[PDB]
Design a protein around this motif. Structure first.
Motif, PDB file in Angstrom:
ATOM      1  N   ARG A   1      38.017  49.569  45.825  1.00  0.00           N
ATOM      2  CA  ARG A   1      39.020  50.031  47.139  1.00  0.00           C
ATOM      3  C   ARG A   1      38.190  49.903  48.592  1.00  0.00           C
ATOM      4  NH1 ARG A   1      38.533  56.654  46.299  1.00  0.00           N
ATOM      5  NH2 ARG A   1      37.615  56.485  44.086  1.00  0.00           N
ATOM      6  N   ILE A   2      37.285  49.451  48.679  1.00  0.00           N
ATOM      7  CA  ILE A   2      36.751  48.750  49.932  1.00  0.00           C
ATOM      8  C   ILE A   2      37.651  47.804  50.377  1.00  0.00           C
ATOM      9  CG2 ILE A   2      35.178  47.058  50.911  1.00  0.00           C
ATOM     10  CD1 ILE A   2      33.066  48.187  49.022  1.00  0.00           C
ATOM     11  N   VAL A   3      38.242  48.079  51.725  1.00  0.00           N
ATOM     12  CA  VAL A   3      39.219  46.840  52.292  1.00  0.00           C
ATOM     13  C   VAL A   3      38.626  46.334  53.455  1.00  0.00           C
ATOM     14  CG1 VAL A   3      41.408  46.938  53.500  1.00  0.00           C
ATOM     15  CG2 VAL A   3      41.094  48.654  51.604  1.00  0.00           C
ATOM     16  N   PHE A   4      37.877  46.818  54.124  1.00  0.00           N
ATOM     17  CA  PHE A   4      37.114  46.213  55.438  1.00  0.00           C
ATOM     18  C   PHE A   4      35.948  45.800  55.065  1.00  0.00           C
ATOM     19  CE2 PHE A   4      40.624  48.161  57.583  1.00  0.00           C
ATOM     20  CZ  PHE A   4      40.839  49.504  57.468  1.00  0.00           C
TER      21      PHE A   4
ATOM     22  N   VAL B   1      47.113  49.524  37.778  1.00  0.00           N
ATOM     23  CA  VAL B   1      47.489  49.504  36.432  1.00  0.00           C
ATOM     24  C   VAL B   1      46.336  48.696  35.638  1.00  0.00           C
ATOM     25  CG1 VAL B   1      48.781  47.404  36.813  1.00  0.00           C
ATOM     26  CG2 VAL B   1      49.005  48.688  34.538  1.00  0.00           C
ATOM     27  N   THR B   2      45.594  49.149  34.533  1.00  0.00           N
ATOM     28  CA  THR B   2      45.075  48.399  33.275  1.00  0.00           C
ATOM     29  C   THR B   2      45.670  48.477  32.014  1.00  0.00           C
ATOM     30  OG1 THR B   2      43.196  49.479  34.632  1.00  0.00           O
ATOM     31  CG2 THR B   2      42.795  47.827  32.780  1.00  0.00           C
ATOM     32  N   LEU B   3      45.186  47.850  31.008  1.00  0.00           N
ATOM     33  CA  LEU B   3      45.459  48.214  29.758  1.00  0.00           C
ATOM     34  C   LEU B   3      45.263  49.510  29.291  1.00  0.00           C
ATOM     35  CD1 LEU B   3      45.067  44.899  27.793  1.00  0.00           C
ATOM     36  CD2 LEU B   3      47.401  45.908  28.660  1.00  0.00           C
ATOM     37  N   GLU B   4      44.094  49.974  29.627  1.00  0.00           N
ATOM     38  CA  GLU B   4      43.906  51.604  29.492  1.00  0.00           C
ATOM     39  C   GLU B   4      44.604  52.304  30.284  1.00  0.00           C
ATOM     40  OE1 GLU B   4      39.667  49.851  29.641  1.00  0.00           O
ATOM     41  OE2 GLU B   4      41.665  48.764  29.767  1.00  0.00           O
ATOM     42  N   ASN B   5      44.893  51.896  31.364  1.00  0.00           N
ATOM     43  CA  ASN B   5      45.924  52.815  32.362  1.00  0.00           C
ATOM     44  C   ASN B   5      47.295  52.866  31.842  1.00  0.00           C
ATOM     45  OD1 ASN B   5      44.733  51.949  35.714  1.00  0.00           O
ATOM     46  ND2 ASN B   5      44.632  53.653  34.275  1.00  0.00           N
ATOM     47  N   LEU B   6      47.584  51.746  31.057  1.00  0.00           N
ATOM     48  CA  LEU B   6      48.964  51.403  30.721  1.00  0.00           C
ATOM     49  C   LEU B   6      49.809  52.918  30.355  1.00  0.00           C
ATOM     50  CD1 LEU B   6      50.879  48.818  28.939  1.00  0.00           C
ATOM     51  CD2 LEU B   6      51.361  49.898  31.074  1.00  0.00           C
ATOM     52  N   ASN B   7      49.179  53.561  29.243  1.00  0.00           N
ATOM     53  CA  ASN B   7      49.800  54.590  28.529  1.00  0.00           C
ATOM     54  C   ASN B   7      50.131  55.889  29.788  1.00  0.00           C
ATOM     55  OD1 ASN B   7      50.713  56.405  26.748  1.00  0.00           O
ATOM     56  ND2 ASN B   7      48.675  57.355  26.442  1.00  0.00           N
ATOM     57  N   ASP B   8      48.765  56.056  30.417  1.00  0.00           N
ATOM     58  CA  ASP B   8      49.155  57.125  31.481  1.00  0.00           C
ATOM     59  C   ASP B   8      50.102  56.821  32.700  1.00  0.00           C
ATOM     60  OD1 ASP B   8      47.238  59.575  30.864  1.00  0.00           O
ATOM     61  OD2 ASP B   8      45.749  57.983  30.618  1.00  0.00           O
ATOM     62  N   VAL B   9      50.163  55.583  33.079  1.00  0.00           N
ATOM     63  CA  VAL B   9      51.179  55.097  33.793  1.00  0.00           C
ATOM     64  C   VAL B   9      52.517  55.322  33.433  1.00  0.00           C
ATOM     65  CG1 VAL B   9      49.220  53.410  34.387  1.00  0.00           C
ATOM     66  CG2 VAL B   9      51.807  52.689  33.982  1.00  0.00           C
TER      67      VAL B   9
ATOM     68  N   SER C   1      41.716  58.293  34.784  1.00  0.00           N
ATOM     69  CA  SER C   1      42.152  56.879  34.192  1.00  0.00           C
ATOM     70  C   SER C   1      42.768  55.868  35.377  1.00  0.00           C
ATOM     71  CB  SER C   1      42.837  56.756  32.884  1.00  0.00           C
ATOM     72  OG  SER C   1      44.216  57.093  33.019  1.00  0.00           O
ATOM     73  N   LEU C   2      43.633  56.459  36.392  1.00  0.00           N
ATOM     74  CA  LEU C   2      44.217  55.828  37.359  1.00  0.00           C
ATOM     75  C   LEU C   2      43.168  55.457  38.167  1.00  0.00           C
ATOM     76  CD1 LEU C   2      47.530  57.779  37.560  1.00  0.00           C
ATOM     77  CD2 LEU C   2      46.803  55.962  36.255  1.00  0.00           C
ATOM     78  N   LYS C   3      42.160  56.567  38.338  1.00  0.00           N
ATOM     79  CA  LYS C   3      41.155  56.316  39.495  1.00  0.00           C
ATOM     80  C   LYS C   3      40.812  55.077  39.575  1.00  0.00           C
ATOM     81  CE  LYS C   3      38.668  60.420  41.399  1.00  0.00           C
ATOM     82  NZ  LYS C   3      39.562  61.360  40.809  1.00  0.00           N
ATOM     83  N   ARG C   4      40.715  54.719  40.976  1.00  0.00           N
ATOM     84  CA  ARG C   4      40.286  53.290  40.997  1.00  0.00           C
ATOM     85  C   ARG C   4      38.707  53.045  41.168  1.00  0.00           C
ATOM     86  NH1 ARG C   4      42.252  50.058  45.965  1.00  0.00           N
ATOM     87  NH2 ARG C   4      42.133  48.187  44.846  1.00  0.00           N
ATOM     88  N   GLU C   5      37.992  52.089  40.321  1.00  0.00           N
ATOM     89  CA  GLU C   5      36.528  51.713  40.694  1.00  0.00           C
ATOM     90  C   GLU C   5      36.392  51.975  42.253  1.00  0.00           C
ATOM     91  OE1 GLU C   5      33.265  51.645  40.400  1.00  0.00           O
ATOM     92  OE2 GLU C   5      34.223  52.101  38.543  1.00  0.00           O
TER      93      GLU C   5
ATOM     94  N   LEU D   1      25.829  44.980  40.979  1.00  0.00           N
ATOM     95  CA  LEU D   1      26.039  44.294  41.912  1.00  0.00           C
ATOM     96  C   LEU D   1      27.097  43.150  41.757  1.00  0.00           C
ATOM     97  CD1 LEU D   1      22.489  43.214  43.495  1.00  0.00           C
ATOM     98  CD2 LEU D   1      24.278  44.690  44.517  1.00  0.00           C
ATOM     99  N   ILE D   2      27.472  42.890  40.367  1.00  0.00           N
ATOM    100  CA  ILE D   2      28.625  41.657  40.247  1.00  0.00           C
ATOM    101  C   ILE D   2      30.028  42.468  40.890  1.00  0.00           C
ATOM    102  CG2 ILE D   2      29.860  40.501  38.617  1.00  0.00           C
ATOM    103  CD1 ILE D   2      27.186  40.360  37.307  1.00  0.00           C
ATOM    104  N   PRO D   3      30.172  43.604  40.654  1.00  0.00           N
ATOM    105  CA  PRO D   3      31.282  44.228  41.223  1.00  0.00           C
ATOM    106  C   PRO D   3      31.603  43.934  42.673  1.00  0.00           C
ATOM    107  CG  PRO D   3      30.352  45.653  39.803  1.00  0.00           C
ATOM    108  CD  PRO D   3      29.470  44.749  39.879  1.00  0.00           C
TER     109      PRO D   3
END
Length: 572
Positions: free
Chosen positions: A384-387, A225-233, A376-380, A403-405
């Motif tokens: 989603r790197i977990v390991f 959920v982001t502010l731009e997501n909100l509507n679609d969620v 818009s729900l898609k995750r950057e 690189l900042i991400p």
């Protein structure tokens, strides 16, 4: 007939011949007896057989289950050589034949006994347990996802309901991983799949409905959920009967205010009236400051978005509310006092005059029935790197974009957990990599994030300082590279000393202090001055240690050395 022949023997290319002959026959599928004959006499060579023979062998598993089941229960009964062969076949089955689940759905769902045994194989996962020494849960879920996708693209309509159970069991394997793959990378991909998802839960038990939506969907939505997501969620949540599924406790858990608001506003007035009551009672019985805060804002939310002027005034006259106000005034938490006075002004005009600018900040957010922008729900991707395993693979990249991400993500992961597994190895590479980074697309605030990434690795894994301080010497980096590394050292030292609790630093003081002190004495403006200052920080941070005396001796050689030299301390 072939099933009689194999029981006695077989050249590995005669076994292949028998199999080829089996397939030219009408399919049927493998009875318990025939599979028992197959497992004992064939599988043992599986790897040896030509690809044509493996394929028709796997398809037999594809259509039996009673076959698969047997291959599984035989694996755990059973050097490790034989089991590794059986493991092979098992993995290739679910790997290459993504149909299994959806095939078994049609064939072996005639009784609860069969359904439950199929659930226990796939999702409670007796299968995974025999594959555990070969593949990990993430990879297994990867396969499980493809298993669902196949059924999701089949012509199976009006899903059962026990299918709901199965999905719950899928998530339960590992909620976080399951959510990434089943939600993020399947049910939330397109309309087609999400539509399937609705059907599956709408045609599903109420208890399970709650688990799927409240304990799996919601938390995932909260991750993205982001502010731009909100509507679609909200478009996605309106698609469910939230009135039956969402309890206060669930509403309390949700951290995102805007999301919390969106859900408050999807509640019927009947739900609203019930919650407002619950909340009011809770407000009156006020013990926990943190819980009262969450409660008051939920009030504000409902009172503002879901109630009329009059219903609001009713609460204002509730003995419960009135008494709850008195108890809030009896608080010594000024905040708590204000909270009450605010809500009281909010509910009615006749409350007890009380001037203050204090408020509770309800969001206030202001789109076409069922046209949902899943994109818009898609995750950057990086998010989603977990390991750590995968972080490091990124640092080793024709590298793509910003690189900042990545640095941001490195902080997140390393600080949250890390741990003690094979973590030391990856952290070390990652740190090494991060030190050498140059700002390739010069993004603002780089360097800060570099320092953050470094500091956090140093704080979570202090003794990773050994290699870091060696990189500051030995390897050839730019002034800047050096400057910010030096910065991370000081920053982490201070965090570990935790004065700015728990001198988590004393245990490592000398690891920071000596290599740097000698570095100075035996080797040696902008830079030296920084070096000196960060060495000073580390020296103070080591203020109890125990060989602090020794440190002090070294130190006034260094200080005295600095004076002559003409270098300066930077009041850092």
């Amino acid at each position: 007939m072939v099933l009689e022949t194999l029981k006695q023997g077989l050249d590995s290319s005669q076994i292949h011949e028998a199999l080829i002959q089996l397939d030219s026959y009408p399919r049927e599928p493998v009875d318990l007896d025939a599979s028992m004959v197959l497992i004992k006499f064939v599988i043992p060579v599986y790897p040896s057989l030509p690809e044509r023979s493996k394929v028709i062998l796997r398809r037999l598993a594809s259509k039996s289950f009673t076959f698969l089941c047997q291959i599984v229960t035989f694996s755990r009964t059973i050097g490790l050589q034989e089991i590794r062969i059986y493991q092979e076949i098992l993995e290739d089955i679910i790997s290459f034949e993504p149909g299994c689940l959806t095939f078994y759905l049609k064939a072996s769902t005639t009784s609860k006994a069969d359904r439950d045994s199929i659930k226990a194989l796939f999702f409670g996962s007796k299968l995974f347990n025999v594959l555990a020494n070969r593949i990990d849960m993430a990879k297994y879920l990867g396969y499980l996802r493809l298993q669902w996708k196949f059924l999701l693209e089949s012509n199976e309509t009006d899903p059962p309901g026990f299918l709901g159970e199965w999905l719950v069991s899928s998530f339960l394997l590992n909620p976080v991983l399951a959510a990434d793959m089943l939600l993020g990378e399947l049910f939330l991909l397109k309309e087609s799949y999400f539509f399937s998802f609705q059907k599956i839960i709408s045609a599903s038990s109420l208890i399970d409905q709650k688990r799927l939506i409240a304990k799996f969907l919601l938390p995932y939505i909260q991750v993205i959920v982001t502010l731009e997501n909100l509507n679609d969620v909200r478009k996605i949540l309106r698609r469910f009967d939230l009135d039956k599924i969402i309890s206060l406790s669930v509403l309390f858990e949700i951290q995102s205010l805007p999301l919390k608001e969106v859900i408050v506003r999807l509640m019927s007035n009947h739900s609203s009236t019930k919650f407002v009551s619950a909340l009011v009672s809770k407000f009156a019985d006020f013990t926990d400051e943190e819980v009262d805060t969450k409660t008051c804002e939920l009030l504000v939310l409902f009172a503002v978005h879901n109630l009329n002027h009059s219903q609001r005034e009713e609460i204002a006259h509730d003995e419960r509310f009135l008494n709850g106000v008195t108890k809030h005034l009896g608080s010594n938490e000024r905040e708590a006092r204000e909270r009450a006075m605010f809500i009281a002004k909010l509910l009615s005009g006749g409350h007890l005059k009380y001037e203050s600018d204090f408020k509770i900040n309800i969001p206030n957010v202001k789109s076409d029935d069922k046209i949902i922008d899943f994109q818009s729900l898609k995750r950057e991707i990086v998010k989603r790197i977990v390991f750590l395993k995968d972080l490091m693979k990124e640092y080793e990249k024709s590298r793509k974009a910003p690189l900042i991400p990545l640095l941001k993500q490195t902080v997140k992961l390393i600080r949250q957990k890390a741990f003690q597994l094979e973590v030391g190895y990856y952290a070390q590479g990652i740190l090494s990599s991060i030190v050498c980074l140059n700002n390739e697309f010069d993004e603002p605030l780089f360097e800060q994030w570099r320092i953050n990434a470094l500091t956090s690795i140093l704080v979570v894994l202090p003794e990773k300082v050994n290699g870091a301080i060696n990189i500051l010497f030995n390897s050839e980096l730019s002034l800047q590279q050096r400057m910010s590394l030096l910065s991370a050292l000081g920053l982490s030292a201070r965090e570990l000393r935790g004065l700015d609790t728990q001198n988590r630093f004393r245990k490592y003081a000398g690891l920071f202090f000596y290599p740097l002190a000698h570095g100075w004495l035996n080797g040696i403006q902008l830079f030296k001055s920084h070096y000196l200052t960060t060495l000073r920080i580390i020296y103070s941070c080591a203020n109890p240690v125990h060989d602090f005396e020794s440190m002090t001796e070294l130190m006034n050689h260094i200080i005295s050395s600095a004076i002559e030299e003409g270098i300066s301390l930077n009041k850092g």
